[PDB]
Symmetry: D2
Subunit: 393 residues, 4 copies
């Protein structure tokens, strides 16, 4: 497992920089200087860094302060060669955003939130980022009568189309990536899953540059299959970015290291990212980003250790996933289970609906009881998969 910048492993400033405050306690770690994060990450083999506007530039920063911080940060980047592929906006920590940014009930707050986004598109464009992520963490409610739900989607759309229009207008080479989360910090968050994110994009005026940024753990907080969810994003050609982390069930957002949650699911996500679909189709080509948090029990050792562990796990999974598809025994099991058979169209070329109702062999004389005896042998194909994952074969 030796990462290299050709792997395209990206990390957020807030990931290794997470200080350790959770809702039951305060920080266990001192703040991390952004110059050091950049240097350290570059020596680990990372390809780039990502930040929320306020991870770097304090909310209340004066202009002299802002310029100093960017000079320092631009210095570090020049020095190490790290790229800045994604930039996002913090529309959830200041008290002003307690009801949302884009979908706040207070109209003045909505205006400030959108203004804040627009300024950050400029920053992102100047840093050379290709993706602009939107995570609407405070968009939602605890109680069902708190919102007009139709107006909430209208407001949402208005903010996202305004940002997309501005990108088009300014000539910037950026795409927006929506990032779904079912709950936390709100009781219910708007556009809860990958499916709801895809759906909403189809109702936008400038939806052509608006896509998804799915996060492992987020999908798993509604108990969904991450791999199935990104497969649908990919099939719609909307998988613009990916956030990899780990979660161990339906509960608070854990943000563990990728592979430290549901392991078999992590193996099949790697397989999908690396091998694509068995019958061919689109392949994911962007950065492999890690939006995790080093457990608060661990000191600064642990922070670089956990950063190292993300890349190790991905690499270890990749090696196994490549060995798995290369295996001749796995290819035969795949043919036997009908994996390649699923890729053949149901209908024969130029055969219509009426033509099919009409074929006797297809319905009226179809031997249903005889077709039902097929042994799909999915258990054995899963056993082969697990034995490659364990490095048994």
């Amino acid at each position: 497992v030796q990462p290299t910048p050709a792997d395209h492993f990206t990390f957020g400033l807030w990931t290794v920089g997470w200080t350790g405050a959770d809702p039951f306690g305060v920080a266990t770690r001192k703040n991390l200087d952004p110059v050091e994060a950049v240097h350290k990450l570059a020596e680990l083999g990372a390809y780039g860094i990502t930040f929320h506007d306020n991870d770097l530039i304090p909310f209340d920063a004066t202009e002299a302060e802002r310029e100093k911080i960017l000079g320092d940060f631009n210095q570090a980047l020049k020095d190490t060669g790290l790229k800045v592929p994604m930039v996002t906006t913090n529309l959830f920590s200041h008290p002003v955003f307690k009801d949302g940014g884009f979908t706040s009930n207070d109209r003045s707050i909505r205006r400030f939130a959108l203004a804040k986004v627009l300024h950050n598109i400029d920053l992102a464009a100047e840093m050379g980022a290709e993706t602009f992520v939107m995570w609407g963490g405070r968009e939602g409610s605890e109680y069902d009568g708190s919102k007009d739900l139709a107006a909430a989607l209208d407001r949402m759309r208005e903010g996202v189309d305004t940002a997309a229009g501005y990108i088009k207008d300014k000539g910037y080479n950026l795409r927006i990536a929506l990032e779904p989360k079912p709950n936390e910090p709100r009781g219910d968050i708007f556009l809860p899953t990958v499916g709801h994110g895809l759906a909403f994009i189809e109702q936008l005026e400038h939806g052509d540059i608006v896509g998804l940024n799915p996060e492992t753990g987020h999908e798993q907080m509604a108990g969904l299959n991450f791999t199935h969810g990104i497969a649908q994003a990919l099939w719609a050609e909307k998988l613009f970015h990916i956030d990899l982390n780990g979660q161990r069930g339906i509960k608070y957002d854990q943000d563990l290291v990728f592979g430290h949650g549901d392991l078999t699911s992590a193996f099949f996500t790697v397989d999908l990212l690396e091998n694509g679909f068995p019958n061919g189709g689109p392949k994911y080509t962007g950065p492999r980003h890690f939006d995790y948090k080093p457990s608060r029990t661990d000191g600064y050792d642990g922070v670089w250790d956990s950063a190292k562990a993300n890349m190790s796990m991905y690499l270890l999974l990749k090696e196994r996933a490549l060995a798995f598809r290369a295996d001749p025994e796995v290819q035969e099991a795949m043919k036997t289970s009908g994996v390649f058979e699923l890729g053949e169209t149901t209908l024969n070329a130029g055969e219509s609906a009426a033509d099919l109702m009409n074929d006797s062999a297809s319905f009226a004389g179809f031997d249903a009881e005889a077709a039902a005896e097929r042994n799909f042998a999915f258990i054995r194909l899963n056993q082969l998969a697990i034995e490659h994952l364990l490095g048994s074969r």
Copy 2:
């Protein structure tokens, strides 16, 4: 609570007809004659009945048998005046469908499944049904390598576009309604939630007549907010049908009577169906269908009792939900929380992105700390809602 056919309460044949077999035991109730179901339902105040092709016509039925059953069933309908607003296909109980219907890995099975659908579109059209529901219960997997996930969506699309093309072609006044379910009977089901159902429809050639049929309990098995999910379907103008039942958490599909699961969520769904959105927008206008199962502990009493309980609960919720919006105290609390305020566009008419970045009052001189002092008073608006639900006020 006195239902009347003007309420548009519909029930499936398989709902009151559910015999009681679950995966740990056999039936506790004798089979229900479809003629009696129709008569009984008509005396309760139901508006119509719905069935799966095989709920009525046995899989192996000869043609003389098929004609007899339809004559009996058409007799009963003529006699009672009951309508048949929705018809669906059973693509999950016979052993042939163990891997799916439309997305089975075996191509011959896919062909039979689609042929079976096409024949059932004819039946539906002859019964005067307006909606054709598709529930893909066996479309999915237990194991991640069992399917090419892209090919599975291609196959799915091919089956649904073929059915839609056939409706268009035949001149039938029917619309397809996809019905999402996260899991059970498979480990993971394709198009798990309302969001995934909406998304998939946008990738179809004939998506204009393809919409959703969300079920209360299905959304709640992924822990989502039913009311938020149908609000998005409504906003996209894709809420073609609705299945009401109850569920008490993330676990097996319980199918309890509507209102016998999450009660406050049942109240806000009724409010949405009855009152629409606070600021106006689309309103749901079809049948209120109940896809529940009378608990197996209860005898034939209980079966009509539980059918009666569905309509009672809906009516009782409706009365409370109407009282709630009519209340002057509730309207003031609503104004105070910014519910109507959310309906105002963020931007002023003909104000662009650049115009907003540029307004000083919106960003550079916006007093964030002062805007953050607003008391949204969402707890009190929720207390008013609950006190109307309990018939306290």
Copy 3:
């Protein structure tokens, strides 16, 4: 709904004083003075107030500071008449308790957590509290190999039995109540549910004075039936205190107002607290403590509103629950479903196991098919409860 001090409504200092920082944001409210909490709680109708040592006395407070704080506090108590029924210790906020208090892997942190508990028992005695609550919030792990799981329970026992021997040696009139939680802030918390808590107590040397403190939301984070769990606690005569709140599903601890989560479960929880068991048995007669958090979207008017709403909600449910059991149609429905029949012993007085084996009418001569026809009528019985809850009956 007019709460009075014999209702035994007690509130934590940390509930109304919760300022609003969650894991994605900053406090939204100004700190609340302890003297001002006592005055407000007492005016609203509360009977008592509870606290965590560090809620009242800063962790850093000098001895001088300690004594000053306790004088104003005791003065307010004296001026208002509020009791202090339960006191608890903070073994979770300071960075030192990052791997736990009693089960920390570091031996010198275990002794410091235990010494902090012992000093807090002297303060509990001093304030006249009858219950000392233990929430082991940091006792657990993110990863399975972090702990020797046998040792962790041995260290948990050592702490609780040391503390209990100290009560007994000092002759304080005080009981220990453990408070289970499945997760958050740890991935997995030890003694995660009522059941684990009850079992663990049977392994203690001093178990006689150790009981439970179940919290609504906590059991509902594992998808358990809170009425059923507190019924089991009560049946073992181990329900020493109770914490009431709201939770809308399997997700982060929400701490809503009691009744703003699962409404029907809250109804049945109030029925067990107030009415006890249909056939007679134990009754819980301690205080009704509200361990919740005023939503961060709301100002101080919401804070006092939310405190008032907990009380209101319990009183509305109480009156509906009393009306429900008093109702003769409900009592007949109960009779029909066999609620009273379950109260009869299975064996006749003096019947041995050998006797029943050998009794031909209970096995050999048993008509199982006839017995299976019984209509338990559980659906009609549930419909009667909801109708009563909706104030329709």
Copy 4:
């Protein structure tokens, strides 16, 4: 992976013989003959076979039939050498147990369920079983007012203590093991987790011979940590038997092959069964029983494949788990994280509660801020386990 009879791999008749009916469909496989199950299990390397009375003897079987069935069965056992380590009773399939066995509201069903249990104890004795398992699958409710919850536990106690007195009076060398399940087939099952099961046993008269039978998937249906739950059972010396399988989340009981659910948890479960506790303590030495279902998509080649896969999976995990603990880098990592340190008593030999209170270096003179700097290094320790599990180390 070459399983042999000293591995103590036992299998239920109902697992491989599970024909495939779920709640949405019909059996997909032909019945499996009991004599043929014994021959196949024995050839594959199993050590024993287990059954439910009705798995082997039809509920209707005449006495003539009974004796015939038991002769071919005993003959196969004799020919193969397979033991019969555990026997259980079916108190869930026949319509008569629709409201339970031992806790049915109907008194004559309670006596019939108890008499069926007593007769089954004579058969258990007769086959040389050491454990009699009790799964109370129908003991529970859909609705909260269906039962008097105190009475239900009293009726559950009566049944288990009657049965245990019968063992003791007859001097059978047999222990009772209760098997918890949170839900399915009931909405809420009584004694839903390891914890509730352990607590309930402490209320019995004959508790000394009553223990638990935890099942992987069952605790994982409430989102609990299975290693942590069986650790608590083991710590109380109550782990009498164990049922191993796979579950991918909070949903319907899947009964996958052991290792095809949560892989990292299975790894740590094998470590506790085989290796026990890091600091020494109790060890479980009973049989490793596989209570799972061969996926319905597969034919008989899948059935024998799946039985083989359970064994393989346990043996691959066993070898990786042994390699993992033997590894000196892992032993040093363990030392660094304080795994061995937790094994030391908090108090010094002879130290009283008063002593520690009064010891200035454990409280007053404690540097909490210094103690909080410790790097527990739990993330690196988890990375070492996964690397070992992936056969990388």
